[PDB]
Amino acid sequence: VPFVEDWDLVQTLGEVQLAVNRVTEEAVAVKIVNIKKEICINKMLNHENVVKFYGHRREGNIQYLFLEYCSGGELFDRIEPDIGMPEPDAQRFFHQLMAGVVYLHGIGITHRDIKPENLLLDERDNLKISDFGLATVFRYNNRERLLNKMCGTLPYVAPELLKRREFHAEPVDVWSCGIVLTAMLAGELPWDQPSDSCQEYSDWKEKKTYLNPWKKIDSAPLALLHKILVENPSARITIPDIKKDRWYNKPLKKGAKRPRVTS
Numbered sequence: 293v294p295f296v297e298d299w300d301l302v303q304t305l306g307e308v309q310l311a312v313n314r315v316t317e318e319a320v321a322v323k324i325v326n327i328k329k330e331i332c333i334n335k336m337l338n339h340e341n342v343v344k345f346y347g348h349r350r351e352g353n354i355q356y357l358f359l360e361y362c363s364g365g366e367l368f369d370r371i372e373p374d375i376g377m378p379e380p381d382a383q384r385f386f387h388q389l390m391a392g393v394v395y396l397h398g399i400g401i402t403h404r405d406i407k408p409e410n411l412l413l414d415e416r417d418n419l420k421i422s423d424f425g426l427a428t429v430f431r432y433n434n435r436e437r438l439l440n441k442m443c444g445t446l447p448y449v450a451p452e453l454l455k456r457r458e459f460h461a462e463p464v465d466v467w468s469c470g471i472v473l474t475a476m477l478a479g480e481l482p483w484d485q486p487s488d489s490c491q492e493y494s495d496w497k498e499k500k501t502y503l504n505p506w507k508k509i510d511s512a513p514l515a516l517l518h519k520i521l522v523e524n525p526s527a528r529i530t531i532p533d534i535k536k537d538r539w540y541n542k543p544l545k546k547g548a549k550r551p552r553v554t555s
């Protein structure tokens with residue numbers, strides 16, 4: 293099959309470029325560059341809510357990561373500033389985020405930088421966790437390794453990452469998912485960082501939910517955020533319990549409209 297291995301770089305996505313196959317016209321994302329770990333972790337991954345890794349090629353000092361193209365773009369761009377998005381859309385995206393995070397944690401991988409810029413959407417609006425550049429193995433040979441490195445983006449980091457020397461990996465990803473859920477429902481980030489010097493963070497711990505972003509959020513998803521955004525990571529809700537929450541299991545969204553005729 294001649295020219296089947298030839299890909300044309302047609303546009304920049306985020307360096308990340310959209311590549312189109314010369315013969316088949318298949319669209320892929322290619323990332324051009326810690327890096328050895330990123331490729332290793334990517335080779336472990338296979339899930340419908342995790343951006344697919346096709347392979348890698350090294351041209352001297354440049355690494356080319358061949359990854360799944362997500363035409364829907366970033367979840368970030370589905371969030372209307374100060375508004376968010378319809379609650380059924382946010383619930384569906386939150387379900388898909390949980391399936392992807394359950395998968396990652398199940399194989400002992402923590403993403404460490406979950407935010408809407410890293411949550412991509414395919415052609416059918418299916419959420420895909422992306423960018424495994426900060427990701428690490430927290431469970432190996434069924435032995436959990438406690439983390440100590442500062443990783444992430446301050447508005448999304450769990451408070452234990454700033455207060456404690458060591459912390460468990462899984463509650464940190466759970467916390468950032470709750471900040472993502474907040475962003476989806478209110479179109480704003482609740483604080484700059486989860487610290488006592490942050491008035492907004494201090495107000496949330498004081499249960500001042502009559503303030504923004506919380507007053508824009510319905511009591512059923514807000515009750516879930518009350519269980520996720522818990523300062524003590526040991527008292528914080530786990531994903532198996534998130535899956536039992538009332539809003540998580542609340543019927544809200546119809547399926548993808550399917551073509552139909554009458555009479």
Ligand SMILES: Oc1ccc(-c2ccc(-c3[nH]nc4c3Cc3cc(O)ccc3-4)cc2)cc1
Pocket residue numbers: 305306308321323330334343359360361362363364365366412422423424425
């Ligand atoms: O380890 C990594 C590192 C990076 C990624 C990765 C994989 C795919 C993409 C990608 N695929 N499709 C898109 C993007 C960015 C984007 C941004 C847009 O505004 C629109 C589309 C896309 C971007 C980054 C996945 C795993």
